[PDB]
Write an enzyme that holds these catalytic residues in place. Structure first.
Site, PDB file in Angstrom:
ATOM      1  N   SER A 179      50.042  28.768  -7.579  1.00 30.88           N
ATOM      2  CA  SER A 179      49.682  29.602  -8.939  1.00 30.88           C
ATOM      3  C   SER A 179      49.517  28.898 -10.088  1.00 30.88           C
ATOM      4  O   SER A 179      49.412  29.292 -11.243  1.00 30.88           O
ATOM      5  CB  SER A 179      51.205  30.451  -8.901  1.00 30.88           C
ATOM      6  OG  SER A 179      51.235  31.301  -8.122  1.00 30.88           O
ATOM      7  N   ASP A 203      47.964  46.754 -11.818  1.00 32.73           N
ATOM      8  CA  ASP A 203      48.251  46.025 -10.621  1.00 32.73           C
ATOM      9  C   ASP A 203      49.176  47.236  -9.867  1.00 32.73           C
ATOM     10  O   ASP A 203      50.470  47.436 -10.135  1.00 32.73           O
ATOM     11  CB  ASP A 203      49.268  45.054 -11.187  1.00 32.73           C
ATOM     12  CG  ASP A 203      49.879  44.265  -9.593  1.00 32.73           C
ATOM     13  OD1 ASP A 203      49.553  44.519  -8.603  1.00 32.73           O
ATOM     14  OD2 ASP A 203      51.045  43.843  -9.941  1.00 32.73           O
TER      15      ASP A 203
HETATM   16  C1  LIG Z   1      51.651  31.265  -6.710  1.00 28.57           C
HETATM   17  O1  LIG Z   1      51.793  30.557  -5.934  1.00 28.57           O
HETATM   18  N1  LIG Z   1      52.534  32.398  -6.393  1.00 28.57           N
HETATM   19  C2  LIG Z   1      53.329  33.196  -7.499  1.00 28.57           C
HETATM   20  C3  LIG Z   1      54.781  32.982  -7.524  1.00 28.57           C
HETATM   21  N2  LIG Z   1      55.435  32.451  -8.748  1.00 28.57           N
HETATM   22  O2  LIG Z   1      56.022  31.356  -8.608  1.00 28.57           O
HETATM   23  S1  LIG Z   1      57.571  31.177  -8.900  1.00 28.57           S
HETATM   24  O3  LIG Z   1      58.451  31.448  -7.824  1.00 28.57           O
HETATM   25  O4  LIG Z   1      57.827  32.312 -10.108  1.00 28.57           O
HETATM   26  O5  LIG Z   1      58.242  30.008  -9.714  1.00 28.57           O
HETATM   27  C4  LIG Z   1      55.479  32.273  -6.493  1.00 28.57           C
HETATM   28  C5  LIG Z   1      54.927  32.848  -5.065  1.00 28.57           C
HETATM   29  C6  LIG Z   1      53.265  32.448  -5.010  1.00 28.57           C
HETATM   30  C7  LIG Z   1      52.732  33.552  -4.335  1.00 28.57           C
HETATM   31  O6  LIG Z   1      53.105  33.904  -3.474  1.00 28.57           O
HETATM   32  N3  LIG Z   1      51.615  34.351  -4.907  1.00 28.57           N
HETATM   33  N4  LIG Z   1      51.277  35.463  -4.096  1.00 28.57           N
HETATM   34  C8  LIG Z   1      50.500  35.164  -2.651  1.00 28.57           C
HETATM   35  O7  LIG Z   1      50.346  34.175  -2.236  1.00 28.57           O
HETATM   36  C9  LIG Z   1      50.050  36.449  -1.784  1.00 28.57           C
HETATM   37  C10 LIG Z   1      51.410  37.693  -1.788  1.00 28.57           C
HETATM   38  C11 LIG Z   1      51.900  37.531  -0.458  1.00 28.57           C
HETATM   39  N5  LIG Z   1      51.012  36.785   0.633  1.00 28.57           N
HETATM   40  C12 LIG Z   1      50.010  36.062  -0.554  1.00 28.57           C
END
Ligand SMILES: *C(=O)N1C[C@H](NOS(=O)(=O)O)CC[C@H]1C(=O)NNC(=O)[C@@H]1CCNC1
Ligand SMILES: [Cl-]
Length: 458
Positions: A179, A203
């Site tokens: 992210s 969303d």
């Molecule tokens: C980015 O890597 N994502 C956003 C979340 N924010 O990081 S934190 O925990 O607030 O510090 C962290 C998780 C990550 C994420 O999983 N994003 N979503 C996905 O990868 C898809 C949803 C579930 N399968 C993939």
């Protein structure tokens, strides 16, 4: 009878003049000495005896009487300058050129302290100058064991540990940036015009491209509702960037993220920096020989797929967001022989068609740490300065790596930090406090308050 005299290796200093590498007198000839030992094994590197191969690749004249050579790090990259010229018994040998590093080791030590023994990497950058203020890769090793020749046992203690003390995670550690790329992806969409700073996206907890019934799900299953640029950043919504990457295309996405330094190496003087990977339609035709599917672009919008990024490529992107697009490559060597080195191949600056987008994405990153609904809002409650950062997770038995980048102060950038904590899980909970400890040591005085130098607004 005439007899050659070897030159003395150039001295290495930090940015404040503390000596990083001396030469000590030995008999039956000088040995190189690293008075700070493990705190610089991956930044400076070390020297060792000269092997069978590099002797037929070195001047038998100038390296006569020189029985040691740079192996990795700064010692190798600038081995030419650090070596010098030989004399003859009296033509006196000109000593090697002295190098002043950009790293402040009061920040290098505070960063290793902030890592708290965990495996990973920390890179701090001064965005206006490009000076590498810190370059941390954990665990460490003593570079003073290879200078004389390391026991084949003690080498195995390094080689046969699964913590990999020999792995330079900053340079050859490649991780899906997760992210953390979303600010740069937002600027890619904002620049093309596919998304505007107020344009909204509902969303429902997932995203579907207009062809397939397959759902690309958000990290929050139940959705965030209507999200805009800022809401998408301080909540790190995946559907917003799923939708942004779709309307943008990988042709113009890979091109934009490349101008940010993803794909090839970024730094000026870092030996063995891995290029990373910013996938394109041409790469997959070469590598895997299959057509690009539109679903592969959406995973890239949130920093996944085959994308590979080094912790320095991340830190340079963080300095780039702080620098409003002025491209200056990171560099360890502050000066060579008293003058700063010049970049032979610069990178073009990132000139947005609306330069105010910098301040909008930075404000989105700013609300990540200080917003009422930021992922790292707990980090901002303990801060004396505004932090424009963003947390993330890397993709991987064991858990996944926690990531957090950020620059501070947000309104007058003086520090840019990228932190990768191996198996940290919570980018918001472990990787974010590490940045703030590294940023604190650079901005706060020794009584906990913001330094007078950095407080005044510009
Ligand atoms: C980015 O890597 N994502 C956003 C979340 N924010 O990081 S934190 O925990 O607030 O510090 C962290 C998780 C990550 C994420 O999983 N994003 N979503 C996905 O990868 C898809 C949803 C579930 N399968 C993939
Ligand atoms: Cl939350």
């Amino acid at each position: 009878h005439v007899q050659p005299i070897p030159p003395t290796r150039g001295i290495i200093f930090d940015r404040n003049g503390v000596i990083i590498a001396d030469n000590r007198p030995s008999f039956s000839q000088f040995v190189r000495h690293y008075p700070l030992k493990e705190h610089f094994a991956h930044s400076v590197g070390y020297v060792g005896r000269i092997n069978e191969q590099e002797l037929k690749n070195l001047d038998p004249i100038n390296y006569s009487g020189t029985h040691h050579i740079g192996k990795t790090g700064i010692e190798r990259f600038y081995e030419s300058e650090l070596h010098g010229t030989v004399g003859y018994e009296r033509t006196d040998p000109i000593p090697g050129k002295d190098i002043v590093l950009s790293i402040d080791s009061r920040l290098q030590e505070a960063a290793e302290n902030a890592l708290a023994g965990r495996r990973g990497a920390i890179v701090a950058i001064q965005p206006s100058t490009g000076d590498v203020l810190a370059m941390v890769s954990q665990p460490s090793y003593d570079p003073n064991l290879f200078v004389t020749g390391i026991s084949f046992k003690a080498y195995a203690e390094l080689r046969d540990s699964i913590d990999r003390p020999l792995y330079n995670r900053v340079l050859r550690g490649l991780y899906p940036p997760g992210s953390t790329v979303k600010p740069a992806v937002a600027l890619a969409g904002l620049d093309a015009g596919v998304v505007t700073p107020t344009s909204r996206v509902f969303d429902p907890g997932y995203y579907q491209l207009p062809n397939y019934d397959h759902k690309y799900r958000n990290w929050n299953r139940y959705g965030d509702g209507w999200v805009s640029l800022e809401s998408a950043i301080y909540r790190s919504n995946d559907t917003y960037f799923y939708d942004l990457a779709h309307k943008l295309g990988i042709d113009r996405l890979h091109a934009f993220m490349s101008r940010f330094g993803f794909g090839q190496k970024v730094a000026l003087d870092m030996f063995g920096e891995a290029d990373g990977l910013m996938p394109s339609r041409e790469w997959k035709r070469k590598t895997r020989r299959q057509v690009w599917y539109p679903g592969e672009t959406l995973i890239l919008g949130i920093g996944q797929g085959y994308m590979q990024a080094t912790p320095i490529q991340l830190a340079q992107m963080t300095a780039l967001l702080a620098n409003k697009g002025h491209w200056i490559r990171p560099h360890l060597a502050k000066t060579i022989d008293g003058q700063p080195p010049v970049d032979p191949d610069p990178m073009p600056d990132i000139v947005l068609r609306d330069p105010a987008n910098w301040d909008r994405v930075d404000y989105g990153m700013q609300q990540v740490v200080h917003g009422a609904r930021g992922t790292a809002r707990k980090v901002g409650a303990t801060s004396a300065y505004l932090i424009a950062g963003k947390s993330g997770t890397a993709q991987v038995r064991h858990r996944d790596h926690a990531l957090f980048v950020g620059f501070a102060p947000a309104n007058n950038p003086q520090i840019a930090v990228a932190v990768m904590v191996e198996n940290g899980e919570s980018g918001s909970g472990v990787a974010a406090p590490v940045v703030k400890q590294v940023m604190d040591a650079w901005l706060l005085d020794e009584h906990g308050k913001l330094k007078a130098e950095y407080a005044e607004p510009v």
